[PDB]
């Protein structure tokens, strides 16, 4: 109850809406705050798309080495890796890493397309028992994050449970799980978010997200020092369409829910 009040006060000062889901796998205890409300996933959805490709590769062993053409007309708003490979190709492995570790939007679009479109990424979540996740649009419009819009949303509880199944559970084959975890542990975008609220000695694999209405997200699997692993989802969105990102809010939330662990 103390943590709930701290998160409520953090939220008040932030001026936005905060969603938190922490799963402690030591005993399956949880800290939940607006955990059943819907939030625009933004780029945190790229974990689901990469996972669906990994699942597909479980029956197509050389799948991750297949080449995908990168076209100039594919470039959108944020293409840090794909812009370097225009007029060439990238493997699905490289596209998965680019989406997860640099939040490349072209890579996400290639991941979505390869599994049949957003409805197939959603079908994958259903296959995992996730009835809340829904992916409706491609990059970049899936990040609009309009209040009241259910497109491209999920709840902190649903994503925390699915991330547990993906990174610590049996959603993926163990070889594919290891690749997903390795990729997420190599993320370059998360130093100011969840990671920033945890001790430096803790190992973090995370995927961040940014969108309209100042939406600022992060989902992580965490191996604390001398503790069982944790799953943490911190979603944050704001009332103003042009609101600025608040990664500091996610760091504060992580510090609050891990205080005293
Ligand atoms: B995605 O949300 O991830 C992302 C991030 C991040 O990881 O927080 C940072 C910068 C760009 C991206 C690409 C994805 N978000 C968007 O494309 C979004 C950026 C702000 C305006 C609306 C589109």
Author numbering: 31 to 291
Quote the study that presented this structure, word for word:
β-Lactamases can be divided into four classes (Ambler classes A, B, C, and D) and manifest considerable sequence and structural diversity as well as different, but overlapping, substrate profiles. Among the SBLs, the extended-spectrum SBLs (ESBLs) are of particular clinical concern. Of particular note are the CTX-M enzymes, which have become the most prevalent ESBLs worldwide. Cyclic boronates act as analogues of the first tetrahedral intermediate that is common to both SBLs and MBLs.
Crystal structures of cyclic boronates 1 and 2 in complex with class B (BcII and VIM-2) and D (OXA-10) and PBP-5 from E. coli have been reported; however, structural information on inhibition of the clinically important class A β-lactamases, in particular ESBLs, by cyclic boronates has not been described. The overall structure of the CTX-M-15:cyclic boronate 1 complex is highly similar to that of the search model, with a root mean square deviation (RMSD) of 0.194 Å over Cα atoms. In addition, there is a hydrophobic/aromatic interaction between the side chain of Tyr108 and the planar aromatic ring of the ligand. Interestingly, and as seen in the CTX-M-15:avibactam complex, a water molecule is observed in the CTX-M-15:cyclic boronate 1 complex which occupies the same position as the water responsible for hydrolysis of the acyl-enzyme intermediate in CTX-M-15-catalyzed β-lactam hydrolysis, Wat4 in Fig. 2 and S6 (35). A structure of the CTX-M-15:cyclic boronate 1 complex reveals a conserved mode of binding for this inhibitor, very similar to our previously reported structures, with a tetrahedral boron center and the closed bicyclic scaffold maintained as in our previously reported work.
